[PDB]
Ligand binder design. Structure first.
Ligand SMILES: CCCCCCCCCCCCCC(=O)O
Ligand SMILES: CCCCCCCCCCCCCC(=O)O
Ligand SMILES: *C(=O)CCCCCCCCCCCCC
Lengths: 41, 610, 633, 633, 33, 33
């Protein structure tokens, strides 16, 4: 990926990266919102 | 608060001042428009809506879109005036620093959000593919796998069109923005650090090595309470008349063969006396007046179309023989013929007795051959008639209405040519045509007592019941109750549960009372065990409560106590679950953890790192 | 916060102290007394003689309650004109007027009230707070017919449209309602009140205030409508949040922790409510239903036996080979209903009419196969019976049985299993007061009929016709042959598996929309569990495939799972045989829902938008039919 | 708010670009680092040698989440009487303590967090957060069976009444619980604490303080019960909103616009999970279903044939007039399983017993109906076979075949039909290792058996026998015959359609409780369409009816829909054959639903109150039985 | 004071002018304490 | 803050370090008065 002579990014295919799927870190973004209109007034 | 801002005109302060208050437009802070008062809840929700967008900020600013954040809280306006919905209610409500907004600016905001979410309609899919192609979440504990291996896998399975192939780093950082289990080194300093943002949101979604996670506890008891509420436990266990438009439910159709039935059990049939030695032949016209000749005889059967709760009938003849020495079913016709008369069908021997008659629809038959050698078989017929008491427009209370299905032809059939008194020997389907009437044992009714349906039915009467009968509605609502229990209850064979002890109490005071017959004392343990078995029997089959001669469910008091104790049993829960529930759930979770670890090990060995 | 206002008496205490706290009653805070409640709405009498003069405990009102009980007040105020036309509730309750803001120890128990010292907590008595909700709910009773009349004025002709804008002149639409609304409508009575209420709740309708010839918007719900309104690019935010939650709801029900388990699981945990099933013992292949015992045939043995019932009257019947019975043991109590209706059974000297048939239960050590004389039956009883009525059928000259309901329910605990060497069987055949010539009748039994078989136990399940306390979900995948399923029991683990894992299929289809032979985020876990199932070194001829091929296999396989979820259990299933296939897919459905972001499919949304305009086109076509028949001056 | 606390790098207030910020870290705010945390509840150890000294990221909690997590603690406090006996968690965690309020720029990206400064933002570290959620749900494990016991004490005898109030002396009921509580119940070891804990959560239970003989309410949930009680005129409040949204969940799931859409709609967005369907093959009129290609009746042509299976293992079978084969193309990959159990086939010279049958797949260019010889079959193979056993049936002197499950699943993705003229047909018939005589095998096929079908794909929608990826769901209204449906393929749109429409049907019934002819808010949608449509110049004589008629005529049609959904796709329905009315029917539902404001039917109120009091009448009846046979001293 | 049958009155259904009154409120007893 | 499967640890069971926690105490009724 490195498009520059000097790299100061995050080597995705580099070493030192960590992959530890844990229960405490169960992924989610924004499944649903309480957009009920009675509660929205 | 909530509503619309208000502005005063007159010098009145008293509540219920007649013309005190008038609406406040935008000008009272070109195009002057009214204003609305936002609430705290809506503000929280809409701000959370924005926070979805910045989950993908990197890919966005790479894609040169939406370079400045929406910032909902900014678009607001702050005033402290009268607020409410009705003037005569806002007049006694005056808040401080309420948030207000024009409808158009609010629309512009939500439209920006909506169109923004439109663009990422594919990038989200690609990220979902990335997180789902291999397990990036585990139920219990924690698993792990080297990053070179997993990355070498992704560059081996993601489709060539996937955006990750052309926009890697932003995809990676977005992944880490919601998955604490993936981290990226910071070669600037050389540090590894959680970057996931939904930290607290995932805590409730986690186990605790002794208990199940919170979310399924809360949600499962949610569904339990929802079912028991929607079942209307007051009505189902009532003790007085209830109008059918309340009691009734969407019903399911029924299957029948009229010839197979018992005439006395089925209250909705009349029959012409067997071996009466009377064979008369009568003629009826269609809706276009064409006269068809039909023959009747003893052994005929009909249906008493009065007191039916308007129905729809479709007949099916497939598989039946109806072959005859000089009367081949092939090429013939059958129809639904209505008979309207004052005379009971048991008293019909002549022609003019029949009163008014009509045929409503007819078909042609066909004859093929079957498994048995030299035997002919009729095709599938779907001849139907949907009944409504409005059309025939009953006037005289002594007027009677009978429906029959038999052969019809345009030539006078010799009676000796054929011996079937009808063709009701055929699988019949009967589907309710209305949803606001309810019957009982073939009798129409208007005011049922949901209690006294307990134990009032024999099994053959249950199979001979009409599709729109109160018994079936009772079954279905108690069925919802049965699930509610099953979601709640987990007590195994021969074990007391908070959903069986009402039966125990009803029995325990029943044993101590004074009535008909010898007394049979039992210790309390037997009573509890019995109640458990009976409740599990109800769970096995809802219809068994109404059954005559039931072991326990034959008692109305047992049923009432069960139904009512259900409500308290659910409502008094406190984020709790059963014991075997938790133990098995945790054990299974650990098993799945082992499975995931083994699989990711297969990956690590099948995709080496330098 | 919550809990109860706690007062301190310890007087030198900080935390966990033995006797620091006491309940705080309405004498401590006289403002929370029922003589000092503001009598707006007059719900408490002004006569001196009628007040209890007693004290009641006080309780704490939270953020959510005030923000909600106040929200209820608008339901009245949306219909405020009809109220004063009705002269009820001259003054709005204004809930925040019946509270008292205090600062003291607060909490459900004294232990955690003891460090929870807040400020300006709202406080109320059971009676004063009870009086409040009575005030509200009375008005709902008063508005009962108004609400029905209001709605039918709205749901008569289309007034909301999913997309864009339609139009209609006022004099047409007011004329339209004029003739078609019910005579007893409250609109006829008080028509201008019906006018004002719409504009409060519907922005489209607007009333020109005659004073200035002006017109503006009036709807109080402006913010909410936007959350329910489409943009021309995508579906509304409202249900995009809702159509996704139900998936997370359905998955929560299935409990993928269980259906992905690789360990024994107790039956009550795994069990689900069962459904009735149907069988025919006579045609049921003996080797497939491992619960049917059958005396062999062609031995020439033939005899009769006599067995009483609970009433003590004796009975006479026959026995011979070929006879099928059910092993009542280890069948997790069932209910048996057997309708002879539809069969012939006619014999050259024995018609079935008039006679009776019934259920027989047997008990012995000697297995049912060796039975060849009369003294090998041990214990016996006749538990039910019914008569036969034969009418005649289409099939010429041949009579048929009418509907029957021979019914019985096996219960172990009553039958009181004690001996490991026992054996219990159920038999149904012709029974009679007088004995029967063994050759006047020939049928080995009367099982040539239709039986219905419903479970009675709940938390106890069988697998392959045998009951077991523990069960492993994985040991079911791809082992029940199509035959073995049909010959199985109702209360079977497979059937218990088909339904419970079916709810996944509902969840997958409402979330994903993949067409034929293209991937999906739920098709992909399978797509991964293959490449590594393939790359390793093993038995057979290893078959290599591009990911473009590996993809489509799952993409089809996921479609097959939806249509018939019971395909996974089929032995030698095409793709879904592997447990790892099932595990990867089943686990991932949870993840694919947690990570959605208010997103619709690329295919889906356009169709909804395309649909929405057509309905808009339909409405305006309708709205002109009002114009052409109800013109305006 | 929400997000992550961002810090300014470099100088104070020098923030000008998104690249001039940085995520905070517990180093920056050391108060939120675990050597400082208030160890109340004793979670973190006290060894100075077991502590990380490693910093962790900081996260922001949301104001609507603290209210939720505080109440999580409230669950325990309903049991603290038992806890301190159990000697667990002596100090309630009081979540607020773990929080720390710092003010900074907060967001979920450095860009937007730049523009978003805030004051007094609570913060937490993920490790500390896990400790608190643990601290609660850990203790729940302890309460596992104390919870079960007391929930029994609540429900063994009626302690909640639907209406009014009921009474009985304590000293009586206690003797009963003493008489019935399981001997292993914790109550029998801890009566006093169990007594207190109940009185916490039940207003009626009221113990007496012996020190000065006072009895008072101890309910801490006096506000929750407020909205759970009924009034004297209407049902309770808590449920109507529960009841009213629950209909609104069915409608959105049913997606009203799609099922009332005039534009073309694709398959995978419309297709929904299917249902197995059952047919009989000989009995079907050949001119009804297109998927049945049958060689002309009474052909009387004899032609034997050799075929080879998937291993080439030869099988032999004959073809004759009346043989019927399935037109395998356009079948939307499907699963056929055939069930032959019951039928005889036993001819006079050729017994079924000990023979094999199987599916045969035919592939040729020549149309199948024109077949006369072996050069017209093209390519044909067997795909599965079974074995048949015989029994004896109700009709004496003829045997009967046992039950069979011949199966085969169809998928076009593997055959790869590449030329349209290439034609795919499937037959089921007898197969044997030896050629069979035509004079004996007079059966044209073996299609005289019940046959089951399940779709193996949820993206293919069939209409009128054929399959097309485009559907117009407006046209399916009233466009089928009863004959069409039973002949319809299992994945027919109208089958899927009524399933989508079923929820709409259900959602109505939850709302409406009207009787004959009774105009409802969900009836008048049709009434209007009848109003115009009567008046317009349609085909036929114009006939006029008054408004009351149009009400009831719509009223019958309404319920006629609710009673049964198949009437929307029925040729010549009373009204429903109209495409137009179905359109205006759905769009009525939403406005009806969204404009309800906390009320139910007038009939429902009068029924519920009279019904509910009967329980209160009944419950007292039960209760006074106890005081008699358990007398108060 | 308003002319229901007079001209000048605006009737114009917009999606953005969607209609609601008070469908439901969230009264879960757990969340009311 | 310790590495279970790391190095540096030592496993040297000895006579002088033979495990025991609390088998039994001397709680005679006569002894306790
Ligand atoms: C869009 C709904 C508009 C409804 C306006 C109020 C109803 C009109 C009143 C009907 C009676 C008119 C009497 C005249 O005179
Ligand atoms: C309404 C139930 C309140 C709590 C009842 C507690 C029941 C205790 C059963 C008897 C305990 C005996 C202990 C001594 O002896
Ligand atoms: C660096 O040397 C540029 C080329 C390597 C970039 C990594 C491979 C490209 C795709 C990102 C990760 C691979 C899986 C998508």
């Amino acid at each position: 990926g490195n498009a520059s002579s000097i790299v100061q990014t995050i080597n995705v295919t580099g070493d030192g990266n960590v992959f530890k799927p844990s229960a405490e870190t169960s992924s989610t973004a924004v499944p649903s919102l309480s957009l009920s209109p009675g509660m929205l007034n | 608060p909530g509503g619309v801002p208000w502005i005063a005109v007159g010098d009145e302060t008293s509540v219920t001042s007649p013309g005190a208050l008038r609406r406040m437009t935008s000008k009272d802070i070109y195009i002057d428009e009214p204003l609305v008062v936002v609430t705290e809840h809506a503000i929280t929700n809409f701000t959370k809506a924005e926070m979805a967008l910045e989950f993908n900020r990197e890919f966005l600013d790479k894609m040169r879109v939406l370079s400045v954040s929406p910032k909902y809280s900014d678009l607001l306006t702050y005033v402290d005036c009268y607020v409410g919905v009705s003037a005569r209610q806002a007049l006694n409500n005056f808040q401080k620093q309420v948030p207000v907004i024009t409808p158009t600016r609010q629309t512009m905001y939500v439209d920006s959000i909506q169109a923004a979410l439109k663009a990422l309609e594919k990038w989200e899919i690609d990220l979902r593919v990335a997180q789902t192609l291999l397990p990036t979440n585990v139920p219990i504990g924690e698993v792990s796998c080297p990053m070179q291996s997993v990355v070498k896998l992704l560059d081996d399975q993601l489709p060539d069109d996937s955006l990750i192939r052309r926009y890697p780093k932003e995809a990676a950082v977005a992944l880490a923005k919601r998955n604490g289990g993936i981290q990226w080194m910071d070669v600037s300093e050389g540090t590894v650090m959680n970057e996931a943002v939904n930290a607290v949101a995932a805590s409730a979604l986690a186990p605790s090595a002794s208990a199940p996670p919170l979310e399924e506890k809360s949600k499962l008891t949610e569904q339990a309470m929802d079912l028991v509420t929607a079942a209307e436990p007051e009505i189902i266990a009532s003790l007085v008349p209830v109008p059918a438009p309340v009691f009734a439910i969407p019903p399911k159709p029924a299957d029948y063969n009229v010839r197979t039935l018992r005439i006395d059990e089925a209250t909705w049939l009349r029959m012409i006396p067997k071996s009466m030695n009377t064979p008369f032949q009568i003629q009826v016209t269609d809706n276009t007046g064409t006269n068809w000749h039909l023959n009747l005889r003893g052994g005929t059967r009909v249906v008493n179309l009065d007191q039916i709760a308007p129905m729809r009938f479709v007949l099916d003849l497939g598989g039946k023989s109806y072959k005859e020495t000089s009367w081949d079913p092939n090429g013939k016709k059958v129809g639904f013929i209505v008979f309207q008369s004052k005379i009971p069908f048991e008293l019909w021997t002549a022609a003019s007795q029949i009163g008014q008659a009509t045929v409503v629809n007819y078909v042609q038959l066909y004859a093929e051959d079957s498994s048995f050698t030299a035997q002919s078989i009729i095709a599938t017929t779907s001849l139907a008639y949907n009944y409504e008491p409005e059309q025939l427009n009953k006037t005289d209370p002594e007027m009677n209405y009978y429906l029959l299905a038999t052969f019809i032809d345009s030539a006078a059939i010799t009676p000796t040519n054929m011996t079937q008194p009808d063709v009701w020997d055929a699988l019949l389907t009967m589907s309710p045509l209305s949803a606001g009437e309810v019957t009982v044992k073939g009798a129409v009714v208007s005011e049922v007592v949901p209690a006294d349906l307990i134990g009032s039915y024999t099994p053959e009467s249950l199979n001979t019941s009409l599709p729109n009968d109160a018994a079936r509605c009772m079954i279905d609502r108690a069925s919802k109750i049965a699930e509610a229990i099953k979601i709640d209850d987990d007590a195994g064979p021969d074990e007391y549960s908070p959903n069986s002890v009402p039966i125990q109490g009803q029995l325990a005071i029943s044993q101590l009372e004074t009535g008909y017959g010898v007394r049979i004392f039992n210790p309390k343990g037997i009573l509890s065990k019995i109640a458990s078995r009976a409740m599990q029997a109800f769970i096995g089959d809802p219809s068994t409560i109404i059954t005559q001669a039931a072991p326990v469910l034959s008692d109305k008091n047992n049923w009432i106590a069960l139904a009512q104790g259900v409500k308290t049993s659910l409502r008094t829960k406190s984020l709790s679950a059963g014991v075997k529930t938790a133990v098995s759930k945790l054990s299974s979770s650990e098993s799945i953890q082992n499975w995931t670890q083994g699989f990711l090990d297969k990956v690590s060995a099948h995709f080496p790192a330098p």
